[PDB]
Amino acid sequence: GPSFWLGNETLKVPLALFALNRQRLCERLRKNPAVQAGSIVVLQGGEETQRYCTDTGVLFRQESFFHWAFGVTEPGCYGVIDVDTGKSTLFVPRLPASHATWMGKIHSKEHFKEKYAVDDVQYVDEIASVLTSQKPSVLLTLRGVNTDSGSVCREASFDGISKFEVNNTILHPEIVECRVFKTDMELEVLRYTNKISSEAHREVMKAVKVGMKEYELESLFEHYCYSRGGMRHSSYTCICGSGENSAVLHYGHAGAPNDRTIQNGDMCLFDMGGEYYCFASDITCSFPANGKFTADQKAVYEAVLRSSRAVMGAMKPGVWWPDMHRLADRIHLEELAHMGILSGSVDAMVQAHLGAVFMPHGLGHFLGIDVHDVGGYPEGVERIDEPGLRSLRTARHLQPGMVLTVEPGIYFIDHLLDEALADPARASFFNREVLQRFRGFGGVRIEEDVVVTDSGIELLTCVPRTVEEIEACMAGC
């Protein structure tokens, strides 16, 4: 059996992985009472892209659904799967012999059959003819709404498609459910992205110096992942927040691109995750820039370590994800009170929604081929209309084989804080004189990637977490 491999110490991923996904999608559609006999799944791969109107090629990364079904790295492909038999056909672009002048050897269709271990390979321009000869009942295409972006997924289309019966509602929720439940072969890849990203995080912690620019660490992190782990891409733009910037969720975008000089006294919050063969990792480490936690940083950090461990210790099949988020809120509030920042009844603090002031984002989300993976809110799973909870990327109950991030945080965000101090239903909880000490603290977030097993979780991530472990990693070790 063939495998994708970037050599050295990188992971061998069997193409069988994708055969299993195809097989699981078919099994799921045969069980579907409204999937007609003789149906055929028709997916379209992503295409080569350029910067606006220039000839500057953009690096091609495969469309995620298409990758999940076939594992194909080349642009311009299509893929069909006969539902009743499970037979797979890949369609590759016809490159004219003259292209060998600027390409290498132009690969034969047979080269692609053995590469991807699919049942047949044909040219893209013969798609209409090839599907005609199969006399299918219906073409199942991919159309639906991603619940993190709001975008509608592009449906496959080819010249001549109008002569076929096309159903575009059935496939989306089904191919999404398959993706939510990771196979053992998929887990092996997620273990590997986490291992490599964990090593990269360790290296950053070793190298950080007061005086460096944040992007120096971004650069180091991507160099390790690529050179040591074959990860050409990151799963998302690196967030390298130091000082006040640790309080900016999604910092490091074009408008704030990791350009701050790290200073003595700053907390660093680093959320960086490499991507191997279109599989994600998503890992955040928080640590003092100088290698020594102050009392205040120890206190806030250990509050987050506490919610992290309490959530992970409680996760198991049947657990409603929003319950864990509320747990994290409660623990934050408890500890924020133990440290003297808040006073009064934790119950009262909860009933007021104070938790959302300190952790305005969701506790965690599905992870897979996308960092924010599909299937958090299928039909019938409602968004909870409350501050904090409304940002959860899923409201599902945990089941074995799900892959989630566990990412609690405590931040000191000036405009959430000024709001609470202006709301008489929230103001009384604050001790202004101690709060003043934490203005500009930034934030801590501790983000693990876990798998939901039959009875608990498997922790994918391996970074130092306790105060002791972190101060030791930063000093060598």
Ligand X SMILES: O=P([O-])([O-])O
Give the interface with Mn ion as residue ranges (CB under 5 A): 271, 282, 405, 407
Q: Helices 295-314 and 467-474 meet at what angle, rounded to 10?
A: 120
Q: In degrees rounded to 5, what are phi and psi of residue 292?
A: -135, 115
Contacting its own copies within 369-398 (CB under 8 A): 370-372
Contacting ligand X within 282-341 (CB under 6 A): 282
Residue list for the binding site: 250, 271, 282, 365, 372, 393, 407, 447
Could you tell me the two tokens for 451?
């798998």
Closest distance to its own copies from the beta carbon of 68 (Å) = 12
Closest distance to its own copies from the beta carbon of 267 (Å) = 15
Q: Which does 51 bind (CB under 5 to 8 A by kind): its own copies, Mn ion, ligand X, none?
A: its own copies
Contacting its own copies within 259-318 (CB under 8 A): 259, 261
How do strand 166-167 and strand 139-140 relate by DSSP bridges?
parallel
Q: Which does 8 bind (CB under 5 to 8 A by kind): its own copies, ligand X, Mn ion, none?
A: its own copies
Residue 410 C-alpha from the chain's centroid = 21
Could you tell me the two tokens for 455?
């009875």
Q: Should residue 246 be labelled a site residue for its own copies when binding is judged by CB under 8 A? A: no
Give the position of tokens 């350029």.
50
Extract long-range pairs of 144-147: CB within 8 Å, 24+ residues apart: 144/172, 144/173, 144/176, 146/374, 147/374, 147/376, 147/377, 147/393
Q: Which does 381 bind (CB under 5 to 8 A by kind): its own copies, Mn ion, ligand X, none?
A: ligand X
365 vs 465 by CB, closer to ligand X: 365
Q: Which does 288 bind (CB under 5 to 8 A by kind): its own copies, ligand X, Mn ion, none?
A: none
Q: Which does 416 bind (CB under 5 to 8 A by kind): Mn ion, its own copies, ligand X, none?
A: its own copies
Give the position of tokens 């498609």.
161
Query: Which amino acid is it at 4?
Result: F
Burial (CB count within 10 angstroms: exposed 0-12, middle 13-18, buried 19+), residue 128: middle
Residue list for the binding site for Mn(2+): 271, 282, 365, 407, 447
User: Residue 356 belongs to what H/E stretch?
Assistant: helix 355-358
Contacting its own copies within 393-452 (CB under 8 A): 413-416
Q: Should residue 77 be labelled a site residue for its own copies when binding is judged by CB under 8 A? A: no
**Contact present, 383 and 377 (Cβ < 8 Å):** yes
CA angle, 11 then 17 then 21, to 5°? 145
Give me the residues paired with residue 459 across strands: 450
Q: Which does 397 bind (CB under 5 to 8 A by kind): ligand X, its own copies, Mn ion, none?
A: ligand X
Identify the residue among 117, 166, 187, 256 touching its own copies (CB under 8 A): 256
Give the total of residues touching its own copies (CB under 8 A).
73
CA angle, 152 then 143 then 281, to 5°? 65
40 vs 403 by CB, closer to ligand X: 403
Residue list for the binding site for a dipeptide: 250, 282, 372, 393
Identify the residue among 253, 338, 390, 439 touching its own copies (CB under 8 A): 253
Closest distance to Mn ion from the beta carbon of 274 (Å) = 12
Q: Which does 396 bind (CB under 5 to 8 A by kind): ligand X, Mn ion, its own copies, none?
A: ligand X
**CA-atom Rg of the chain in angstroms:** 25
How many other CB atoms are found less than 10 A from the CB of residue 203?
A: 18
Give the total of residues touching ligand X (CB under 6 A).
9
Per CB under 6 A, residues contacting ligand X are 271, 282, 361, 365, 381, 396-397, 407, 447
